């Protein structure tokens, strides 16, 4: 990669060659789109899956879901032409991209994504069966093919990492995690368009030694990088964060109009609560037992949420909306 770059904060301009990690989350238009190299191979593998008792699939990344949306008419047409009464329908995205325990391999219905269901549970859904082939140019194409081995690791050709000027970034098609050295190394910002259920490969992870899963801010089961850049003093794993938001913005600052104090009188850590009740009233006074300020906050399409260790000071938790 060769070119030029201007740093506003550093106040300089730099040209040369090397590696450029772009922020593919706060992009204004869809820079990348998934497409399969052979839709017919996909139809063949879906035949084989449905015959074996696989009733559907769950996408790992959001772009995979959009690809299934773009491709479903032609998949059903190639299926109809190939003499097999099986109808494919793909739905929308919930919060977390939940994982399935089955996989594809290289009247009746076939449900891709959508909401949860008992007729076709995740136990019989295929998941993480696509990997990247090559690239298009100009937007940008990403060609997908069927995976030769089934594992729980996110596709490594989509991941990226970088660190410079004591600012570190772990990035993805749907993640953007910034950490910084201010007296100590800690996570500072995180941006999500998706929330997936794969594992972040350690091959693309900075500072991946001597890491406790119980200290990872972003949980390992939610594609959290196993990294000491995934630390923040005073906080533990945010297992019950508002990850159901699907798209959200985590940082360390006060929720608008609220104030957090550190006391022993505070309640213990539990599922994340939102600063506005179901009726719209604002809960102003919050606390935490042994966390460190500024407070861990999430912001999503329905308001401001707090970290697991931040509870309401005076208000009863029953009136508040929680993420369970």
């Amino acid at each position, epitope marked *: 990669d060769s070119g030029c770059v201007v740093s506003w904060k550093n106040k300089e301009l730099k040209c040369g060659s090397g590696i450029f990690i772009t922020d593919n989350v706060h992009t204004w238009t869809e820079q990348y789109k998934f497409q399969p190299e052979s839709p017919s191979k996909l139809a063949s593998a879906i035949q084989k899956a449905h015959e074996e008792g696989i009733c559907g699939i769950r996408s790992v990344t959001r772009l995979e879901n959009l690809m299934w949306k773009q491709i479903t008419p032609e998949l059903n047409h190639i299926l109809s032409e190939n003499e097999v009464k099986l109808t494919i329908m793909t739905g929308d995205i919930k919060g977390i991209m939940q994982a399935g325990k089955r996989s594809l391999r290289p009247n009746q219905t076939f449900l891709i994504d959508g909401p949860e269901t008992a007729e076709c549970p995740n136990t019989n859904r295929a998941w993480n069966s696509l990997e990247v082939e090559d690239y298009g140019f100009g937007t940008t194409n990403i060609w997908l093919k069927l995976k030769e081995k089934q594992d729980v690791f996110c596709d490594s050709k989509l991941m990226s990492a970088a660190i410079k000027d004591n600012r570190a970034v772990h990035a993805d098609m749907g993640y953007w995690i910034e950490s910084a050295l201010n007296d100590t190394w800690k996570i500072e910002k995180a941006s999500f368009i998706e929330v997936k259920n794969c594992h972040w490969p350690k091959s693309h992870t900075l500072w991946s030694n001597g890491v406790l899963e119980s200290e990872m801010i972003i949980p390992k089961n939610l594609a959290g990088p196993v990294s000491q850049h995934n630390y923040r003093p005073g906080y533990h794993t945010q297992i019950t964060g508002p990850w159901h938001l699907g798209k959200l913005e985590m940082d360390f600052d006060f*929720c*608008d*109009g*609220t104030t957090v104090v550190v006391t022993e009188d505070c309640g213990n850590r539990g599922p994340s609560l*939102r*600063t*506005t*009740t*179901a*009726s*719209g*009233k*604002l809960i102003t006074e919050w606390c935490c037992r042994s966390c460190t300020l500024p407070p861990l906050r999430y912001r999503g*399409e*329905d*308001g*401001c949420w707090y970290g697991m260790e931040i509870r309401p000071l005076k208000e009863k938790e029953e009136n508040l*909306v*929680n993420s369970l």
Partner: antibody
Framework: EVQLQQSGPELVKPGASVKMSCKASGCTLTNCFMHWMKQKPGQDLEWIGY????????KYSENFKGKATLTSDKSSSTAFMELSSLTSEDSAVYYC?????????????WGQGTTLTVSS | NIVLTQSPASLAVSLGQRATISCRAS??????????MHWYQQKPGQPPKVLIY???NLESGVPARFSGSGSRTDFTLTIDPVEADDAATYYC?????????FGAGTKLELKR
């Protein structure tokens, strides 16, 4: 508690534009999402969108994205809505009302409503 | 969008009787264990007023003769006993998913 005062009635020629206001007393930063609704005489209400004067968070419904424009003044704590190219389908009562984000609250308090008549 | 269909379009009820209006959503309005559904009363020439917030919570300072119930797609507003003040139009509204949507409305007429 939260008092809403909307602008006066308006008579506007076809194809022109109108900008109406809504001042909110008794508000706080974290609530105080001014939602806007379009109601023809004795017809169903349409949701246009909302704006927060302090946050400048704005959201539009799809039917009104090209039609309406939401703006805000913090110090006045006032919301402004403007209606682009005006047609007879736009002659109606436009209501300003306090609300919240997506899965948050109900329409607690309402302004009195601005009557707009689009004619020559 | 979530489409709220109200039944009936217009209702005539006698003083002291029981009035029942129904609201039917095209999609579930339930989230976080709560039903994001509300009932409003509009006197003519006046802004609407909240009666039931969520499925079954009485608004502060509203007479206890009003009541709401239901879940998922089906909800019901009950007035008992309906009195002379209640001549007005009644709307249901949901805020589970954008855009926020209203019912068509039920015009209540008093019988005397």
């Amino acid at each position: 508690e939260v008092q809403l005062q909307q602008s006066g009635p308006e008579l506007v020629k076809p194809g022109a534009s109108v900008k109406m206001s809504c001042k909110a007393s008794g508000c706080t930063l974290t609530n105080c999402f001014m939602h806007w609704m379009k109601q023809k005489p004795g017809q169903d209400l349409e949701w246009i969108g909302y704006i927060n004067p302090y946050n400048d968070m704005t959201k539009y419904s799809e039917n009104f994205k090209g039609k309406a424009t939401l703006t805000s003044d913090k110090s006045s704590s006032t919301a402004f809505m403007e209606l682009s190219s005006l047609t007879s389908e736009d002659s109606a009562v436009y209501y300003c009302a306090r609300g919240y984000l997506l899965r948050t609250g109900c329409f607690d308090y309402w302004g009195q409503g601005t009557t707009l008549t689009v004619s020559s | 969008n979530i489409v709220l269909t109200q039944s009936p379009a217009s209702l005539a009820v006698s003083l002291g009787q029981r009035a029942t209006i129904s609201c039917r959503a095209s999609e579930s309005v339930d989230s976080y264990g709560y039903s994001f559904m509300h009932w409003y009363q509009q006197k003519p020439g006046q802004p609407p007023k909240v009666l039931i917030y969520l499925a079954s919570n009485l608004e502060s300072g509203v007479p206890a003769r009003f009541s709401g119930s239901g879940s998922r797609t089906d909800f019901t507003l009950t007035i008992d006993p309906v009195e002379a003040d209640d001549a007005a139009t009644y709307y249901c509204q949901q805020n589970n998913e954008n855009p926020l949507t209203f019912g068509a409305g039920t015009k209540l007429e008093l019988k005397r």
